[PDB]
Amino acid sequence: GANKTVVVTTILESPYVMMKKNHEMLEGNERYEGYCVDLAAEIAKHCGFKYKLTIVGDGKYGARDADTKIWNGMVGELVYGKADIAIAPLTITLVREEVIDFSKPFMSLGISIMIKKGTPIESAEDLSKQTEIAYGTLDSGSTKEFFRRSKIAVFDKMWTYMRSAEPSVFVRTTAEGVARVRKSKGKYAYLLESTMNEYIEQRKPCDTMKVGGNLDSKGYGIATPKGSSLGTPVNLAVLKLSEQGVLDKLKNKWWYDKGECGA
Amino acid sequence: GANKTVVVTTILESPYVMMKKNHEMLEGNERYEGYCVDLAAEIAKHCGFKYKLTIVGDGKYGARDADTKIWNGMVGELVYGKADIAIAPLTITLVREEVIDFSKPFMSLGISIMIKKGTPIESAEDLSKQTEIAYGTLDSGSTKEFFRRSKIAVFDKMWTYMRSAEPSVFVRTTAEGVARVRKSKGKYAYLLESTMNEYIEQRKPCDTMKVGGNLDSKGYGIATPKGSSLGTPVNLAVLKLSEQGVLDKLKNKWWYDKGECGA
Ligand SMILES: CN(C)CCNC(=O)c1c(NC(=O)Cn2nc(C(F)(F)F)c3c2CCCC3)sc2c1CCCC2
Ligand SMILES: N[C@@H](CCC(=O)O)C(=O)O
Ligand SMILES: N[C@@H](CCC(=O)O)C(=O)O
Q1: Which of A8, A168, A211, A237 has the most CB atoms in a 10 Å sphere around its CB?
Q2: Neighbours of B187 (CB within 10 A)
């Protein structure tokens, strides 16, 4: 019956969703800026809904605990009825597609390698054949799972190393992985999605680089709880925004117009 | 009730589906080879179905006639109940998504420019600012529609020219667009999807090139008639094949392992 305010789950991840410098001065949706802030606004406009942005409580993307089988992160928020829609850099994966609905992708990505500039690494193959430079991934998302599940020898070799490396190569947020790259003197490499990698490469201090090709190819989709009547209009909206070049415009705005490291 | 042989519609388009050299010697599905032949086999295996490959009668992707409102091509074949599934380089678009179901993409692409080697053209912007080199697109697919619908000035300028150009810049098949590039002495440029462009670039006589960036970003999806119970298992199969690197393997097989123009 009565339309209600749509509860949007998302995550603080640059440049998708960030607190404005002056957020303490602001209320509600106006506290945040970014690619997914703009995208939420476009989708809401095209679908005729009022919405509230909320940051996922546990600060995670979404993984199911192997013992409890409880979903955390934004996925768990959709699954347990805490949010109506996730509008974030949330990777489309088989295990997630089984439990939530995903629009067609609104952005493509692959897993990629971030280095401190001058690091003697060009590929995953380079990483796997050496021990001097540590490397790891984010917890509780699609990248860690990629390695954990991979039957490809190079990626199996990598996973075998990372899962038992000491101290831990895994980080809780993208910002911590980036900080580790910068602070580790070339002795840590970070495995993260190319979208995130390419953003950070254009931010001061301009000391990191994306090296080599992407290890996989895939995309982010807008997720809804399974069978939600939001799914259909939201998917049509993503296709429309795609076809109008709105998605390209937003990407240019937040990646390259914001570039700090040159033209 | 009783499972039946799934009727697959597809299109003869290199290197997705081609007649084997010795096809007259062969029967059924064995007449054809290609990326979508292999993909049909993987999907069928993962979904537990028997299938028949058939080439779309009219040799078109799919467009709705503005007066009759009748769909042609593979789309029309799904819509009118002539085929159960399309497994082809069929672009996910808003207008098609409204009338058929699409899996998540199994391959990404954008619109791109093919030139005869040495043609003084580097971008769509170059094409739009000149009259010496003609350019056009395929009929009855997503590329023509991109230009017809675009509010972006460069692409509106292009569309204005192409729709009234004499003789016609439009072609009935990819092979005819390619032949026109090769046979036109640098005086014709072809707008086609990057996947197709990149394949042809690696085929003898090795006289064409992809120039500049892609004009858009999108993907091919496996299409089913709207509400078909095939859609769910097929989508899960595409994600699984993606995540196993089967899609990457097939792309390498048909594009680059088949390369004729060097390493
Ligand atoms: C193994 N590889 C060869 C296959 C790669 N595979 C893909 O192309 C692919 C994706 N490709 C894209 O998202 C590219 N894309 N597609 C669209 C669409 F709407 F038309 F579908 C859009 C984009 C990016 C921009 C927005 C609109 S997402 C995704 C996959 C594999 C399964 C996991 C999720
Ligand atoms: N986009 C990823 C998070 C980042 C990563 O795993 O690298 C996900 O949805 O899990
Ligand atoms: N993949 C396109 C056909 C080729 C093109 O338009 O360039 C479609 O599904 O319509």
Answers
A1: A8
A2: 14
Model resolution, angstroms: 2.0
- Is the Cα torsion angle B233, B236, B241, B244 positive or negative in sign? negative
Backbone dihedral angles phi then psi of residue B140, each to the nearest 5 degrees: 65, 35
Q: Is the CB of A177 under 6 A from ligand 2?
A: no
Task: Tell me the domains of chain B and their CATH numbers.
Answer: 4-109+219-258 (3.40.190.10), 110-218 (3.40.190.10)
Residue A232 in tokens? 């259909």
Enter the DSSP assignment of B133: S
CA of A5 to the centre of ligand 1 (A): 30
Question: How close are the terminal C-alpha atoms of chain B, in Å?
Answer: 51
The pair of structure tokens assigned to B225 is: 């008639």
Strand partners of residue A85: A8
Index of the ligand 1 atom closest to the CA of residue B238: 32
Query: How many residues are listed for chain B in this entry?
Result: 263
Ligand at minimal distance from the CA of B86 is 3
Instruction: Give distance in angstroms: CA of B239 to centre of ligand 1.
Output: 11
As for ligand 3, residues whose beta carbon falls within 6 Å of it are B 61, 89-91, 138, 141-143, 192-193
| Residues in chain A closer than 8 A to B248 (CB atoms) | 216-217
Closest to B191 in 3D by CA, of B130, B140, B129, B127: B127
Binding residues of B for L-glutamate: 89, 91, 96, 142-143, 193
Interatomic CA distance for residues A149 and B84, integer angstroms: 33
Contact check, Cβ <8 Å, A104/B108 = no
Under a CB-based contact definition with an 8 Å cutoff, are residues B85 and B195 in contact? Answer: no
Secondary structure letter of residue A255 according to DSSP: I
**CA distance linking residue B235 with residue B85, whole number of Å:** 12
Q: How was this structure determined?
A: X-ray
